[PDB]
C-alpha cells in the first residue's frame, strides 16, 4: 500500500474536508440498508425495520463515528495496517466471526458516501486512490483469518 505522492494528496486533502460526525453513520446505515444480512450484526442497536428507522438510529450514528476513526487511524499507518488493526481484526474474526467480504462491502459503501458528499471533486483518480486505501483496511481487518 504504496500510494504515490500524487495519490497521497488526493486522499488527505479531501479527508481534510470530511464531516467526522456525519459520514460515519451515513456509511454504516447504508451498509445495513443495502446488504441487510449485515443487520444480524446490530440487532441490539434497536429499530432497523426500514431505512428511515435505520438512518436516524442514534446507535448507528454513534458506532459510525468509531468506524471512521478506525479509517482515519489507518489512513495514518498505511505502511503498518496489520499492527494498527490487530485489535479490531481479532474482534471481527475471533469473536464476531464476520466474513471478510463484508469489510469490502463497508469500504465500497464508504467510497459511495464520499462521492455523494463531494460530487465533481470525487474524480476518478481520487476514487482510484481511495479504493487502494479501502482495499488496505479490509485486508488489515481480515488479517486474522490466515
User: What residue numbers does the annotated binding site cover?
Assistant: 1-2, 63, 82, 92, 143
- In the DSSP assignment, the letter for residue 1 is -
Contact call for residue 39 and a second copy (CB under 8 A) = no
Contact call for residue 97 and a second copy (CB under 8 A) = no
Minimum distance, C-beta of residue 68 to another protein, in the bound complex (Å) = 17
List residues binding another protein (CB under 8 A).
Answer: 29-30, 33-40, 51, 54-55, 97-99, 101-102, 108, 111-113, 115-116, 118-120, 122, 124-125, 127-128, 131
How many CB atoms within 10 Å of residue 42? Answer: 17
Cell of 60: 448507528
Q: With beta carbons less than 8 A apart as the criterion, state whether 48 and 32 touch.
A: yes
Cell of 138: 479490509
Partner interacting with residue 30 (select from ligand HEM, a second copy, another protein, none; CB below 5-8 Å by kind)? another protein
- From the list 11, 48, 64, 102, which residue makes contact with ligand HEM (rule: CB under 6 A)? 102
Residue numbers 111-140 binding a second copy by CB under 8 A: 135-136, 139
Alpha-carbon gap, residue 138 to 108, rounded angstroms: 10
Angle (CA) 129 134 137, round 5°: 135
Cell of 83: 499492527
Nearer to ligand HEM, 54 or 88 (CB): 88
Nearest to 107 by CA among 33, 31, 39: 31
Minimum distance, C-beta of residue 71 to another protein, in the bound complex (Å) = 17
Amino acid at each position: 500500500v504504496h500510494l504515490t505522492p500524487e495519490e497521497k494528496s488526493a486522499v488527505t486533502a479531501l479527508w481534510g474536508k470530511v464531516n467526522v460526525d456525519e459520514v460515519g453513520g451515513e456509511a454504516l446505515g447504508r451498509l445495513l440498508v443495502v446488504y441487510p444480512w449485515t443487520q444480524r450484526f446490530f440487532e441490539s442497536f434497536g429499530d432497523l425495520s426500514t431505512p428511515d428507522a435505520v438512518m436516524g438510529n442514534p446507535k448507528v450514528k454513534a458506532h459510525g463515528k468509531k468506524v471512521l476513526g478506525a479509517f482515519s487511524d489507518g489512513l495514518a499507518h498505511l505502511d503498518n495496517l496489520k499492527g494498527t488493526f490487530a485489535t479490531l481484526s481479532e474482534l471481527h474474526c475471533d469473536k464476531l466471526h464476520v466474513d471478510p467480504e463484508n469489510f469490502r462491502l463497508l469500504g465500497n459503501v464508504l467510497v459511495c458516501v464520499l462521492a455523494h458528499h463531494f460530487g465533481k471533486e470525487f474524480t476518478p483518480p481520487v476514487q482510484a486512490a481511495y479504493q487502494k486505501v479501502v482495499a488496505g483496511v479490509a485486508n488489515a481487518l481480515a488479517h486474522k483469518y490466515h
